[PDB]
Each structure stands twice: as C-alpha cells, then as structure tokens.
Amino acid sequence: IMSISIRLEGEDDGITIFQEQKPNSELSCRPLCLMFVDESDHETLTAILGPVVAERKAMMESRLIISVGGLLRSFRFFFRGTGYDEKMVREMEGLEASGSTYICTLCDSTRAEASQNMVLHSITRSHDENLERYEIWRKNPFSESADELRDRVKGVSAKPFMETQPTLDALHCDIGNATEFYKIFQDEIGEVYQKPNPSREERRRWRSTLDKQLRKKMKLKPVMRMNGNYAR
C-alpha cells in the first residue's frame, strides 16, 4: 500500500490521508502469491497467474464497502505496476528481451539512433495500443513482408497479458550505471583511442590493476556480481 487519499465531498481533486513513509524497506512488502517455478516458463507462469490478473481486473470497476471507523465506508482503487526488472517487463509486455533493436520500453526509437540523439524522446508505449499493434501483427492486413511487418508495428510480436506501469526500477538503474562505469574505468586504464581494438588479456590485466587501485585506496574488495552496496 502506497497512498490513501480522499476526494469528498467534492469540488476538489483530493486530500492525501496517509502516504506511506518508507515503501522501500521490506517491512512494507506484503506477499500475495508464491510459485515454485521459473521466470521464463511463460506457460506455467500465466497458467498460475490468470486468477491474479483477472481479479485485479474486476477490482478496478466496482467500489468496496467495509466496516471501518465504526461505520460502513467505501473505497475505490487504482493499480501502479512498477516493481519489475526489465527482463520481466518485456517478457510480460510481449517484447523482445532484451538487447534487440527495440530497447526503450517507452519510446519507439531503434537502437543506433539513440546514440547520435539522446534527449528528445516522447513516451508512447501503452497497453491498449500494444494490444492493437499485436492484432496488426497477427492479421497483417497490409500483407507486408517480415521486416516491414516488424517495423510498422515497432516490433511487438508476443501478445502482452499483464498490465504495466511505464516506468523503470530505481535500483537496477544504479546497478547498470555502476557496471558501466566499472567497465569504462577498466578500459580507460589502458589506451583504446590510441589502440582501437585491444585484446582479451589486456582487459584482464586492466581489470586486475583496477582492483589493485580500488583496494590499496578506499579498501575495497571485488565481487562476482555487484549488489546495491558495491554500486553505492
């Protein structure tokens, strides 16, 4: 639970009653289902999840009456689907995970063009239009060939099933930035604009001297994979 607000009696947008103060700490993370299966077995996952999605669906329509504050009180609901790593979002929004031509889970930009230009990109990706684009893929009313069919639909082949709110995790941005800076340091130890294509052993050695530098000063030890703390 994140926010609970009030619009009554009207003429106003609303008044926040209680905004949660620390949703990050797991001390507020209430579990609702568990499945002894894998993130990839799309069949098994949807087969178990149908209930959850369907009742989330039926929820957003009606209103809810409980006995609260001594009186019978009413409630509406909206749902913000945020907390997923990218891979999951793609595999559940019907995209091509994870490093293919289409990358922005929001903007229809191709990969390469996101290099020359990087700033102005309007958010377009949305659930209803993704269903529309999947239908266009399935029917192919324009009778296009394979790759123009990829393009006109902006590459939405798998039918999404679970709604998503269009946004990114906060942690894994930090994680990817951390690993990218780590590698860029490993590379700038040597010379790559002086030596365009270095070899593998040079990479191992530059990593080693980078770990020596990060250990001698700052007293920092390596790990296999970088969690949040190593990033920070």
Partner 1 sequence: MSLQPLTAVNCGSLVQPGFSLLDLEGDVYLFGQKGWPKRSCPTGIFGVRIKKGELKLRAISFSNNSSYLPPLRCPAIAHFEAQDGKPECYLIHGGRTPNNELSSSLYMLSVDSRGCNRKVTLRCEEKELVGDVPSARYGHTLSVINSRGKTACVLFGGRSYMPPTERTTQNWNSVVDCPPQVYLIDLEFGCCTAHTLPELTDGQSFHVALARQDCVYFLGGHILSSDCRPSRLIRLHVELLLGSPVLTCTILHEGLTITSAIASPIGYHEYIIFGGYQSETQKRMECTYVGLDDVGVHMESREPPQWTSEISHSRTWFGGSLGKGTALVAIPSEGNPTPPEAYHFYQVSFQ
Partner 2 sequence: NTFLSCSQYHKMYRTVKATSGRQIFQPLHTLRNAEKELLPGFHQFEWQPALKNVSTSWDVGIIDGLSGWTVSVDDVP
Q: Does 114 bind partner 2 (CB under 8 A)?
A: no
Q: In whole angstroms, how far apart are CA 4 and each of 33, 59, 77?
A: 23, 16, 10
The CA distance from 175 to 21, in Å, is 24
Comparison of 94 and 210: residue with beta carbon closer to partner 1: 94
Q: Does 168 bind Zn ion (CB under 5 A)?
A: no
Closest distance between partner 2 and the C-beta of residue 146, in Å?
31
Q: Does 139 bind partner 1 (CB under 8 A)?
A: yes
Q: In whole angstroms, how far apart are CA 98 and each of 37, 43, 83, 105?
A: 21, 19, 17, 10
Check: CB of residue 17 under 8 Å from CB of residue 69.
no
Among 43, 61, 128, 201, binds partner 1 (CB under 8 A): 43
Comparison of 60 and 114: residue with beta carbon closer to partner 2: 60
Handedness of CA 136, 142, 143, 149 (dihedral sign): negative
Closest distance between partner 1 and the C-beta of residue 144, in Å?
6
User: Is there a cis peptide before residue 61, judged by omega within 30 degrees of 0?
Assistant: no
H/E stretch holding 17 reads strand 15-19
- The verdict on whether residue 108 carries a ligand-binding annotation is no
Among 1, 8, 33, 71, binds partner 2 (CB under 8 A): 33
Q: Does 46 bind partner 1 (CB under 8 A)?
A: yes
The interface with partner 2 within residues 63-82 (CB under 8 A) comprises 63-67
Q: Does 50 bind partner 1 (CB under 8 A)?
A: yes
Check: CB of residue 189 under 8 Å from CB of residue 210.
yes
Q: Does 51 bind partner 1 (CB under 8 A)?
A: yes
Check: CB of residue 108 under 8 Å from CB of residue 133.
no
Q: Does 80 bind partner 1 (CB under 8 A)?
A: no
Q: Does 34 bind partner 2 (CB under 8 A)?
A: yes
Q: Which residues are annotated as a binding site for a divalent metal cation?
A: 85
Can you give the binding site for partner 2, defined by CB under 8 A?
Answer: 33-35, 48, 50-51, 54-55, 58-59, 61-67
